[PDB]
């Protein structure tokens, strides 16, 4: 059980704006507590496994192998802001094909079945693709790709590019149908590479230009080289000789979130200066706009070769494991760990080495969390900012200080996020003379429904008391030990348990639902959690747990100027430590563990 939320972020902007939007959705979830949307209600009841945001639609892949699609639009003057369609259309399932991964394209969603089969939809079609000449034929390009005789296991896609890996370590990459002009130089059919051989492909990620593959201990990149290396190579070629490009040049670009293929009328003489292109409509294949040369690419008739076809490895340190990788315009971003010390690295394709390396201000143990497999990175690829997901499943804020480092994160109080999706979407039907930003990024959120912790963050005494009363009745019934364990291990952003949530919501706001009423209710909730019989065996575990800053609930109360809360936690700790029966354990040892644990 989860809840679905929508946010939209103007693409040209700073990470602080993304953090502000996340704060806004968190406040809407907590401060306001509005009603849910009926159209997505059914989708909420099942466990989402993946999400992809198309240009105008959205697609969700569930655990039960039943995909759905829903459209969306954005109101421009209000910049939930996203307006959704009246109804959602599902995927017709016959003979229980089921699905494993899904992807997004300008040809809309893309699907992979259990046995391995490349299904897809499109904006122009309201029905899954079928072939009259062959009932078993779908995605005719797959016949070109050769994946019709393979079991597809890994799939990734973005605005234009799509990459597939099967059981036989065969990588098949292609572009959208709009890029068929350059498809000769940007596609490779199913094939196995010696570099990829010897290991199983753990993951693979795509982008508007290139594609990365994460192996057991290595990372590989293949595809179009970025503009900086292009210009370095062009300058080297020019110096070797001692009109960069002639007129009538066919090229394509993915600027403004739309892959457009045009022809260059004027020979390029200034590399930074934007130049005009004449659009080539697909109907004419079967309109003059000045595009910047910063993000374009041209198909070459035959100067050293620009496109890099053979994947190359990017250096990672010794005896280091990779937890999550994703790829954007700036390069490939990853999170790495060796021993117990975790870093966030940005790899430029220029050097192939650690272009940027940053240490998290919080503890590495808190970042690793209960499960190390939930770490993930989200980036659309072109302009969207990075969204991080730590071990506990919550979202780790990412802001840069006045130096080369990560700012001390400010917590969103957002519960763990089951599925995060993001999509480039360029606003249309708007005046061109307006100075407002054109494109944006649509972010869809699947937040877990943690009952008690959301109640605590709401400063809702009544719901918390009812929850605890029904919980004690269930404990008397001896049928909800699982529920007790579940609500004990529940965590919020920063490795914060329910006690940390009570302390954090007990903090003073300003010098002398009302804020004073909110603080009072927080105090009542803290007292209830401390004195209630049910969490007696677990309170020592909760009071001894550490925040992301290595801070127990008492430590947080002292640090956050929640002094009455600190006194309450101190007396509760004394009571629990005295009441606990000594089994080769001391009084001062446990009391210090729950007040100021060793190693701080």
Curated annotation (Swiss-Prot):
Tissues of expression: Widely expressed. Most abundant in testis and expressed at high levels in brain, pituitary and kidney.
Record bears the keyword tRNA processing: no
Residue numbers of N-acetylthreonine PTMs: 2
Protein localization: Nucleus; Cytoplasm
Biological processes per GO annotation: cytoplasm protein quality control; cytoplasm protein quality control by the ubiquitin-proteasome system; DNA damage response; DNA repair; DNA repair-dependent chromatin remodeling; heterochromatin boundary formation; negative regulation of smoothened signaling pathway; nuclear protein quality control by the ubiquitin-proteasome system
Cellular compartments per GO CC: chromatin; cytoplasm; cytosol; membrane; nucleoplasm; nucleus; perinuclear region of cytoplasm; protein-containing complex
Sample GO molecular function, one term: RNA binding
This protein's record includes keyword Zinc: yes
Highest taxon listed in the record's lineage: Eukaryota
Residue positions, PTM Phosphothreonine: 552, 572
Swiss-Prot/TrEMBL keywords: Acetylation, Cytoplasm, DNA damage, DNA repair, Host-virus interaction, Metal-binding, Nucleus, Phosphoprotein, Transferase, Ubl conjugation pathway, Zinc, Zinc-finger
Positions where Phosphoserine occurs in the chain: 80, 281, 384, 504
Family: Belongs to the UBR5 family.
Domain notes: The UBR-type zinc finger forms a pocket that mediates recognition of type 1 N-degrons. The UBA domain recognizes and binds ubiquitin. It acts as an ubiquitin acceptor required to place 'Lys-48' of ubiquitin into the HECT domain activie site, thereby potentiating the E3 ubiquitin-protein ligase activity.
Function description: E3 ubiquitin-protein ligase involved in different protein quality control pathways in the cytoplasm and nucleus. Mainly acts as a ubiquitin chain elongator that extends pre-ubiquitinated substrates. Component of the N-end rule pathway: ubiquitinates proteins bearing specific N-terminal residues that are destabilizing according to the N-end rule, leading to their degradation. Recognizes type-1 N-degrons, containing positively charged amino acids (Arg, Lys and His).
Assembly information from the UniProt record: Homotetramer; composed of a dimer of dimers. Associates with CDK9 and TFIIS/TCEA1 and forms a transcription regulatory complex made of CDK9, RNAP II, UBR5 and TFIIS/TCEA1 that can stimulate target gene transcription (e.g. gamma fibrinogen/FGG) by recruiting their promoters. Associates with the E3 ligase complex containing DYRK2, EDD/UBR5, DDB1 and DCAF1 proteins (EDVP complex). Binds TOPBP1. Interacts with PIH1D1. Interacts with CIB1.
Name of the protein this chain belongs to: E3 ubiquitin-protein ligase UBR5
């Amino acid at each position: 059980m989860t809840s679905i939320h929508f946010v939209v972020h103007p693409l040209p902007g700073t990470e602080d704006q993304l953090n502000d939007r996340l704060r806004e959705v968190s406040e809407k979830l907590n401060k306001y507590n509005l009603n849910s949307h009926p159209p997505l209600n059914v989708l909420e009841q099942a466990t989402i496994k993946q999400c992809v945001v198309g240009p105008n639609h959205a697609a969700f892949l569930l655990e039960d192998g039943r995909v759905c699609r829903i459209g969306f639009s954005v109101q421009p003057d209000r910049l939930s802001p996203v307006s959704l369609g009246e109804d959602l259309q599902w995927w017709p399932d016959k003979d229980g094909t089921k699905f494993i991964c899904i992807g997004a394209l300008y040809s809309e969603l893309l699907a992979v079945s259990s046995k391995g089969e490349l299904y897809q939809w499109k904006w122009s079609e309201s029905e899954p693709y079928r072939n009259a000449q062959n009932p078993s034929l779908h995605h005719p390009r797959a016949t070109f790709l050769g994946l019709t005789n393979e079991k597809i296991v890994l799939l990734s896609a973005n605005s234009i590019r799509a990459t597939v890996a099967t059981e036989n370590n065969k990588v098949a990459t292609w572009v959208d149908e709009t890029l068929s002009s350059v498809a000769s130089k940007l596609e490779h059919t199913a094939q196995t590479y010696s570099e990829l051989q010897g290991e199983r492909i753990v993951s693979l990620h795509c982008c508007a230009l290139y594609t990365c593959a994460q192996l057991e201990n290595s990372l590989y990149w293949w595809g179009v080289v970025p503009f900086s290396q292009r210009k370095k190579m062009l300058e080297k070629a020019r110096a070797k000789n001692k009109p960069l490009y002639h007129a009538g040049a066919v090229a394509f670009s993915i600027s403004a979130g739309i892959p457009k293929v045009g022809v260059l009328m004027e020979s390029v003489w200034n590399m930074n200066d934007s130049c005009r292109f004449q659009l080539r409509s697909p109907e004419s294949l079967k309109n003059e706009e000045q595009w910047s040369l910063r993000e374009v690419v041209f198909v070459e008739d035959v100067v050293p070769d620009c496109f890099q076809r053979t994947p190359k490895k990017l250096c990672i340190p010794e005896k280091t494991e990779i937890l999550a990788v994703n790829v954007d315009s700036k390069g490939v971003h990853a999170v790495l760990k060796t021993g117990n010390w975790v870093r966030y690295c940005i790899f430029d394709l220029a050097t192939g080495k650690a272009e940027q390396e940053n240490n998290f201000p919080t503890s590495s143990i808190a970042f690793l969390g209960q499960n190390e497999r939930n770490v993930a990175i989200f980036t659309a690829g072109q302009e969207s900012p990075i969204i991080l997901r730590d071990g506990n499943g919550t979202i780790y804020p990412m802001a840069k200080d006045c130096m080369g480092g990560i700012r001390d994160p400010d917590w969103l109080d957002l519960p763990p996020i089951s599925s995060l999706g993001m999509g480039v979407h360029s606003l249309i039907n708007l005046p061109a003379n307006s100075t407002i930003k054109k494109k944006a990024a649509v972010i869809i959120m699947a937040v877990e429904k943690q009952t008690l912790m959301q109640h605590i963050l709401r400063c809702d005494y009544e719901a918390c008391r009812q929850y605890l009363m029904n919980l004690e009745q269930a404990v008397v019934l001896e049928q909800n030990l699982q529920m007790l364990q579940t609500f004990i291990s529940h965590r919020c952003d920063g490795n914060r348990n329910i006690l940390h949530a009570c302390v954090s919501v007990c903090f003073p706001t300003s010098n002398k639902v009302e804020s004073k009423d909110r603080k009072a209710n927080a105090h009542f909730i803290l007292k209830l959690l401390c004195d209630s019989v049910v969490l007696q065996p677990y309170l020592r575990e909760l009071l001894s747990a550490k925040d992301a800053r290595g801070m127990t609930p008492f430590m947080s109360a002292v640090s956050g100027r929640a002094y009455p809360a600190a006194i309450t936690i101190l007396e509760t700790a004394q009571k629990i430590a005295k009441a606990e029966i000594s089994s080769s354990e001391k009084e001062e040892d446990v009391f210090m563990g729950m007040v100021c644990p060793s190693g701080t």
